[PDB]
Design a protein around this ligand. Structure first.
Ligand SMILES: *[C@@H]1O[C@H](CO[C@@H]2O[C@@H](C)[C@@H](O)[C@@H](O)[C@@H]2O)[C@@H](O[C@@H]2O[C@H](CO)[C@@H](O[C@@H]3O[C@H](CO)[C@@H](O)[C@H](O)[C@@H]3O)[C@H](O)[C@H]2NC(C)=O)[C@H](O)[C@H]1NC(C)=O
Ligand SMILES: CC(=O)N[C@@H]1[C@@H](O)[C@H](O[C@@H]2O[C@H](CO)[C@H](O)[C@H](O[C@]3(C(=O)O)C[C@H](O)[C@@H](NC(C)=O)[C@H]([C@H](O)[C@H](O)CO)O3)[C@H]2O)[C@@H](CO)O[C@H]1O
Ligand SMILES: *[C@@H]1O[C@H](CO[C@@H]2O[C@@H](C)[C@@H](O)[C@@H](O)[C@@H]2O)[C@@H](O[C@@H]2O[C@H](CO)[C@@H](O)[C@H](O)[C@H]2NC(C)=O)[C@H](O)[C@H]1NC(C)=O
Ligand SMILES: OC[C@H]1O[C@@H](OCCCCc2cn(CCCc3ccc(O)c(/C=N\O)n3)nn2)[C@H](O)[C@@H](O)[C@@H]1O
Ligand SMILES: [Cl-]
Ligand SMILES: [Cl-]
Ligand SMILES: [Cl-]
Ligand SMILES: [Cl-]
Ligand SMILES: [Cl-]
Ligand SMILES: [Cl-]
Ligand SMILES: [Cl-]
Ligand SMILES: [Cl-]
Ligand SMILES: [Cl-]
Ligand SMILES: [Cl-]
Ligand SMILES: [Cl-]
Ligand SMILES: [Cl-]
Ligand SMILES: [Cl-]
Ligand SMILES: [Cl-]
Ligand SMILES: [Cl-]
Ligand SMILES: [Cl-]
Ligand SMILES: [Cl-]
Ligand SMILES: [Cl-]
Ligand SMILES: [Cl-]
Ligand SMILES: [Cl-]
Ligand SMILES: [Cl-]
Ligand SMILES: [Cl-]
Ligand SMILES: [Mg+2]
Ligand SMILES: [Mg+2]
Ligand SMILES: [Mg+2]
Ligand SMILES: [Mg+2]
Lengths: 279, 254, 282, 254
């Protein structure tokens, strides 16, 4: 039957597959996608979370980072009461609903734990806090914390790891102000797009993009983003699993912050999986 | 100017010179790195491109892999900047090489870009991913690739020789093998390749750190806002059947 | 006539009082701090039902209530059972002492439920700073046993017809004999509400007498009118009523009154709302 | 001099003049409000003190109910201030009344203090609970009571008329019944009495609030650093029986 089934898919035109693609998703969701890499035992011999803590990572340089507001982009694609065209000032009811669509496939008790930590119990009803809050839920669960897991486990097994947080808003940015620095809007700068005289970027942003291209190029040459010898500026320190140091890529010089949403990812990477396999 | 005719293992190429405020770079766009994955080759792992007589026109981007197209905010720049900017086709396994205009006389590290967009979309030809400025300002070789997305690169019936799954990831791997064989033709050092990627592309980079057969094809990795372990980048073999057989049923198959 | 319950008690009445007292602490179910063995019972008589259930279904229109806690409710209890704690040193406990200390402060609770306390109460960037851990346990105990219970009561009377006023007593007596790391420990407002600083023999500061006189006046005022405030004096800082939404309290110390908002709101959400759901679903 | 001789419902009393920097205060200390709960009356609800002939010596605090005495830091003020300052006795159900030295011409609001101590300790006679400065300063009437603690107050075999639980609270209620009938002989106003209490004294206040038979004996309530809904302040029936059976086994009671 398997060979029979695939042959039929191979006769169907390509646009009909695309049409019915979002339907196979199990349960309504956001930041979920139907066809992804499968843990088959060929390309991925085990789950990535397994492979990450008993892998061969000594001798490896890794550069990792997040943007300031990772969640925002995804909320207009399924969270109740969000658009780019209004302020997305959601109700508590809409917040509760969006937790179950931002964090799908999870028990009722687990979703209560999410609401426990990302609610502001002095201001449970404030729409602006509720908005940013749900943005952090989706941001933390999907990007910030899986990255922060990788960085520490890589570092602990002998990778030279450097960590950044990108927190500058393109003056050209077309999305509303409440989306902050959305998912994807460091790329323009890493790739030197400000240098294009077509685009309407700041003179000061052009300096910024040249400074980022330098960091990415130093890394590619030397495994270390830092300006070699050159000590004019703050030094960008490698991320360790203990001190957990990262820098802020901003129009200001490197600020060396410490701890990469520590309290949040304790919940996301450690406590929530316990609670799931216990209920 | 003569630095625009280059010969890779599969045959001759004809590139195009590109303009930067700082000065030129020279670029080879739409190099065929796989035999086109279609008809019976839909859902199958990629085969290496059989070699060609003549000169391949590598002056424009090649097609964009078949994918969903965002219609949420029609015309909106922020929406549209990620939407495909070439014809859709399953005939899409092509890669691109930027190199500094006076070709580096000594080996120079290679940056390889894997694009993002949740494994259901993306293309190497988006304007945000343009490599002229990176290659002009820092003089490294840049390579980007196109890989199969959505069901075309990730529908899996785990166990079947017909839909093995991860064929979109094998597409990326075939491109890395191509970098190992031919990047020296452009002044690049096969012994100093750095993967970089965003969103699903960062997830992909990570997955190459964890698949042994891709570990000889690069040496450094940068992961931008993504990771292979996250809750969205993988599914189990049983969910992949559930999701692949449902598509078949929504389309009339059996 | 004997039965058996009648037997038990008839015998216990023969024992000298001092004999009973010496075996009192021995009937507790686990090692614990802030547990006592003979306490009120939900028999259906004096308490119709559990004090929680009574509050939830009560009507308290016509009642004025004055509630409050001190700054450091848990520090006192720690030295009576917590691994590593003592009046006589700085009690810079270790992390393993802290984890063990959590099973004693929160006894009769599942493993996963203490994971949840550890999640909420450690600083995962400084998991092992002894000083932060001392403070953390002093909060686990004080919160779970005093503050979050008080704050649950208070919000719930308020929302069901009561008229509530709240305070945090946060002045440390100049005379205090406990060590400085305990702060303002459980029970050390009383000296002032009863106005002991006025006693010439106890060597209190001249400003501290004023604090007690001033603090006596809120209590008398509340007794008289049901409102700690001065009625004819509007130009002094008002002490607003605590409500379930705005959650205002005042700070009683040497400074004039300051209004604060939220009575450890973020912690008490764990103790009063989530923890019960977790014990109940495991 | 004639201000120190008062007659309550069950006999005559003689009090004592207490000096304060502000002025003097009349005090009536150790007033019997229950027949001594001894012998067959251990673990049983209190009975009201029957009338007496002659004048009771209300000159000084009466005994402290039987309780464990703290010994962690012997001689240390920080723990001894909470320890008994009279002899221990099962004969301890006595209350105290403070009143302004010119006995108030008009009825005065009255405050009633319930000491805390985890329900195993405590005594109205602690120097911390002296009421003279509060009365001096605010010219109100102040009443504190002793109540059985430990197993003498709260040992329970739920369902049995012989050890029914909660008799320490019942002591408190009887003293509240006493104030209602008698506070007016000192100047107090029965229709404006305010309960206040710290720690288990506060949890006690909480429970008179939740117990209909008590909620006629007071009008407003002060809870300091404790509440009836705490994890430590009540116990189940099954558990109180379990702890009472274990005490009797430890004491040799078959
Ligand atoms: C702060 O102090 C506590 C309490 O110790 C007490 O106070 C100190 C000032 C000292 O004078 C102590 O002698 C005193 O008892 C310290 O914790 C205590 O550590 C001692 C070891 O020094 C423990 O004693 C041991 O007990 C075990 C059985 O459990 C025996 O096998 C040993 O032979 C030894 O007797 C004691 O149990 C422990 N107390 C508690 C309550 O845990 C604490 O270490 C100290 N803090 C610092 C940072 O030094
Ligand atoms: C570069 C050269 O000189 N010759 C190559 C030849 O080496 C290459 O063979 C492949 O080499 C790679 C090295 O990265 C692996 O060892 C391939 O094995 C796997 C893989 O893991 O990639 C095994 C795996 O089970 C296969 N998955 C399937 C069948 O579902 C994949 C698969 O065949 C893909 O097509 C690989 O892209 O291969 C090893 O076969 C070949 C490409 O296969 O190309 C020559 O030019
Ligand atoms: C913000 O917008 C969303 C999306 O609504 C769309 O865009 C608006 C500009 C408006 O023209 C809507 O009618 C569009 O559908 C709102 O979500 C919808 O809100 C309307 C009422 O405002 C409601 O009738 C729909 O059922 C909602 N659809 C949902 C929830 O899926 C959202 O409420 C807006 N927020 C605010 C604060 O106005
Ligand atoms: O199984 C039995 C377990 O008991 C232990 O014995 C310990 C003996 C006494 C322990 C104790 C003393 N204290 C004093 C608390 C001070 C207090 C209480 C209430 C208040 O209201 C106030 C303030 N104002 O009133 N102050 N607390 N605990 C074993 O050591 C252990 O190992 C055993 O497991
Ligand atoms: Cl999306
Ligand atoms: Cl469920
Ligand atoms: Cl609000
Ligand atoms: Cl606000
Ligand atoms: Cl320079
Ligand atoms: Cl910081
Ligand atoms: Cl961050
Ligand atoms: Cl955090
Ligand atoms: Cl959290
Ligand atoms: Cl628009
Ligand atoms: Cl060169
Ligand atoms: Cl599976
Ligand atoms: Cl499954
Ligand atoms: Cl630390
Ligand atoms: Cl520090
Ligand atoms: Cl009112
Ligand atoms: Cl505040
Ligand atoms: Cl808090
Ligand atoms: Cl007589
Ligand atoms: Cl001492
Ligand atoms: Cl009665
Ligand atoms: Cl309760
Ligand atoms: Mg994983
Ligand atoms: Mg709510
Ligand atoms: Mg599965
Ligand atoms: Mg928690």
């Amino acid at each position: 039957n398997d060979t029979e089934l695939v042959a039929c898919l191979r006769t169907r035109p390509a646009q009909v597959l695309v049409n019915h693609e979002w339907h196979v998703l199990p349960q309504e969701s956001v930041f979920r996608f139907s066809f992804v890499p499968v843990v088959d035992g060929d390309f991925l011999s085990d789950t990535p979370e397994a492979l990450i803590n008993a892998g061969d990572f000594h001798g490896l340089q890794v550069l990792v980072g997040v943007v300031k507001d990772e969640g925002s982009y995804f909320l207009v694609y399924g969270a109740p009461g969000f658009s780019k065209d209004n302020e997305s000032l959601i109700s508590r009811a809409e917040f509760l609903a969006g937790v179950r669509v931002g964090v799908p496939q999870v028990s009722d008790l687990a979703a209560e734990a999410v609401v426990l930590h990302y609610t502001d119990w002095l201001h449970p009803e404030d729409p602006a806090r509720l908005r940013e809050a749900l943005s952090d839920v989706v941001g933390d669960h999907n990007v910030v914390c899986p990255v922060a897991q990788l960085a520490g486990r890589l570092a602990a097994q002998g990778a030279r790891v450097y960590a950044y947080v990108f927190e500058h808003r393109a003056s050209t940015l077309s999305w509303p102000l409440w989306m902050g620095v959305p998912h994807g809007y460091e790329i323009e700068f890493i790739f030197g797009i400000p240098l294009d005289p077509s685009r309407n970027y700041t003179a000061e942003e052009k300096i910024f993009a040249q400074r980022l291209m330098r960091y990415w190029a130093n890394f590619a040459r030397t495994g270390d983003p830092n300006e070699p010898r050159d000590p004019k500026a703050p030094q960008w320190p490698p991320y360790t699993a203990g001190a957990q140091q990262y820098v802020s890529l901003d129009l200001r010089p490197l600020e060396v912050r410490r701890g990469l949403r520590a309290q949040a990812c304790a919940f996301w990477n450690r406590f929530l999986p316990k609670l799931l396999s216990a209920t | 100017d003569a630095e625009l005719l280059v010969t890779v293992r599969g045959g001759r190429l004809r590139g195009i010179r590109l303009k930067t405020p700082g000065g030129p770079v020279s670029a080879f766009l739409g190099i065929p790195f796989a035999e086109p994955p279609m008809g019976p080759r839909r859902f199958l792992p990629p085969e290496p491109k059989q070699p060609w007589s003549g000169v391949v026109d590598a002056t424009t981007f090649q097609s964009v892999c078949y994918q969903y197209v965002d219609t949420l905010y029609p015309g909106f720049e922020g929406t549209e900047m990620w939407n495909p900017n070439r014809e859709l086709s399953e005939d899409c396994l092509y890669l691109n090489v930027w190199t500094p205009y006076p070709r580096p006389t000594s080996p120079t590290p290679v940056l390889v870009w894997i694009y993002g967009g949740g494994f259901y979309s993306g293309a190497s030809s988006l304007d945000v991913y343009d490599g002229r400025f990176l290659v002009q300002a820092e003089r490294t070789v840049l390579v980007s690739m196109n890989y199969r997305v959505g069901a075309f690169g990730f529908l899996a019936l785990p166990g079947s020789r017909e839909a093995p799954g991860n064929v979109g990831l094998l597409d990326q791997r075939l491109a890395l093998q191509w970098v190992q064989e031919n990047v020296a033709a452009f002044g690049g050092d096969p012994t100093s390749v750095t993967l970089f990627g965003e969103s699903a592309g960062a997830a992909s980079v990570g997955m190459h750190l964890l698949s042994p057969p891709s570990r000889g094809l690069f040496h450094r990795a940068v992961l931008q806002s993504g990771a292979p372990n996250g809750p969205w980048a993988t599914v189990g073999m049983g969910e992949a059947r559930r999701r692949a057989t449902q598509l078949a049923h929504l389309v009339g198959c059996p």
